[PDB]
Amino acid sequence: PHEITGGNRQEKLAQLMRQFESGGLYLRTVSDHRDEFENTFMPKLDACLGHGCDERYWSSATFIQQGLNGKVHDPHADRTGLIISADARLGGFSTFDAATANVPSGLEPSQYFPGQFPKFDMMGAYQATWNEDIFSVDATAVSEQQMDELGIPDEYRSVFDFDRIQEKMAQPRLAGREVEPTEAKICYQPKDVLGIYVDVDSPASQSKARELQQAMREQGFDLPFIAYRGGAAQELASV
Ligand SMILES: NC(=O)c1ccc[n+]([C@@H]2O[C@H](COP(=O)([O-])OP(=O)(O)OC[C@H]3O[C@@H](n4cnc5c(N)ncnc54)[C@H](O)[C@@H]3O)[C@@H](O)[C@H]2O)c1
Ligand SMILES: [Ca+2]
């Protein structure tokens, strides 16, 4: 089952640190860890084994990387989450938290993204150009040259190659200034789950993280606890 789990706890820890100090990786926070386990992770495991479908397929995550002072999405400071391998499938990346939702009812999920991922952020581009015509185009459907004709600055264009997210985030990373949560749509597989996110200041976060980690162990996925904040990712032995 090692081909499905992706390694033991020590191998996953070493994997996520290596990625964190290289090109980065992903962090998906979750308000309902029971739902994430039961309705996202477990269907993905069943599909890996040949049973069900990965119906949800695409999930939101933030890009994290050593030295990048990046916030995660946790408005009430009460979330746990998953540290997710850079090898998860990328459906699109934006530096803005915009309106891009999950796969809607009745839409085919596996290729909903990148096709329906906005190729640029309309709100940011409009504030920067005051170009009315931005709202007369389908942002999911424009090409590079249409974006040029609209005058869309590159700062507002989405990224579709993982290796290129770190180039996008290079200037914020160097300045050390806190950046708002960025957002990627990713399709993670069970083997891509490398760690459990813990906010060490939050009793809610730790209680939820302990339950999620125990639930994952029952399926043979033994994950390290990872305290991420402010461009540092550090292990917690327990809790
Ligand atoms: N979660 C992150 O790390 C992250 C990162 C960047 C931006 N955001 C933004 O935060 C807001 C909340 O997003 P979120 O990811 O916390 O919630 P979500 O959309 O992933 O899940 C919300 C709720 O819907 C269900 N759900 C979970 N995954 C689902 C899926 N794939 N399809 C359908 N239903 C699903 C569960 O009940 C869950 O509690 C959104 O605006 C999002 O763009 C979140
Ligand atoms: Ca959003």
Author numbering: 38 to 276
Task: Kindly provide excerpts from the paper associated with this entry.
A recent study found that CteC, an effector from the bacterial pathogen Chromobacterium violaceum, hinders host ubiquitin (Ub) signaling pathways via installing mono-ADP-ribosylation on threonine 66 of Ub. Regarding enzyme classification, CteC belongs to the ARTC family with an R-S-E motif (R65, S97, and E220), with R65 and E220 being catalytically essential residues. The MARylation occurs on Thr66 of Ub, resulting in an ADP-ribosylated Ub derivative that is nonfunctional in a variety of Ub-related processes ultimately leading to the malfunction of host Ub system. CteC adopts a canonical mART fold with an additional insertion domain, which is needed for Ub binding and catalytic activity.
Therefore, we expressed and purified the selenomethionine-substituted CteC36–276 (SeMet-CteC36–276), crystallized it in complex with NAD+, and determined its structure at 1.87 Å via single-wavelength anomalous diffraction (SAD) phasing. The NAD+-bound SeMet-CteC36–276 crystallized in P21 21 21 space group, with three copies in one asymmetric unit. The CteC structure harbors two domains, a core mART domain with NAD+ bound and a small helical insertion domain with no apparent interaction with NAD+. The insertion domain in CteC is a small four-helical bundle present between β4 and β5, spanning from residue F157 to R194. Within the mART domain, every atom of NAD+ can be unambiguously placed in its binding pocket based on the electron density in all three copies in the asymmetric unit. Overall, NAD+ binds CteC in a bent conformation via multiple interactions. Specifically, the adenine base is primarily positioned by the π–cation interaction with the guanidinium group of the R93 side chain, with additional interactions with W95 carbonyl oxygen and R65 side chain via N6 and N7 atoms, respectively. The diphosphate group is held by the R65 side chain, with additional polar interactions of α-phosphate to N139 side chain and β-phosphate to R113 side chain. The NAM ribose is held via hydrogen bonding between C2’’ hydroxyl group and the side chains of D134 and E220. Curiously, we observed a Ca2+ ion near the NAM ribose, coordinating with C2’’ and C3’’ hydroxyl groups, D134 side chain, A135 backbone carbonyl oxygen, and three water molecules.
